[PDB]
Amino acid sequence: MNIIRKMDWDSMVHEYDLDGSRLLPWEGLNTPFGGAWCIVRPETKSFRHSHNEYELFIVIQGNAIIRINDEDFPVTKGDLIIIPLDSEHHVINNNQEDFHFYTIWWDKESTLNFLTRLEQ
Amino acid sequence: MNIIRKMDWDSMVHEYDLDGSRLLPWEGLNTPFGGAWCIVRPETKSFRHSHNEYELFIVIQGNAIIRINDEDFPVTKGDLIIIPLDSEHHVINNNQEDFHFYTIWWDKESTLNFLTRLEQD
């Protein structure tokens, strides 16, 4: 089982108009949530969407405006954002510096699935 | 409820020899995990402990050493670290700049407690 994953900034995967690195798959790691390290590149904005799976953002570097429903939030390093269920959300980076955040998402399914694997 | 919590660094609570900002409590937030934004100050180390709970570190800023049962894991921005269950873990910051990481921890008690809450909600 692998304790450490060194970040490889050369193998980010573009998805939702951002460049990310997903937590999963990770063999041996049983979690009740999913995650991703996300980079919104300068002068861009991520794809807008909503969903039935709880989510929060941990703001790591840079500055962005985060738009939830029709509202905007200035955000910066250290800020936490909880996205309400059924909310359109996306991230706007107007700065000449990459915007980094980590997202964690979870629901009933992911939590039960964690419990099942500890059973088995 | 609160959609956003702006970080105030001054309000961090010192514990295990680091400065932390715990996620919980957060009214109306139901999670199957806990967590915290942690800073190991320059030229300091955190309090070593072991536990049954699962735990993951997301390394945010700075360079530092995670010692897990005496083997040392050098880490930087972007690295992720799983803490094996019951391991003897702490964080060593030998240089001149703050070391930041986010810890997320979880167990059967926290997941089941999350499920019980939706059902009660």
Ligand code: NA
């Ligand atoms: Na600093």
Ligand code: NI
């Ligand atoms: Ni989302």
Ligand code: NI
């Ligand atoms: Ni721990």
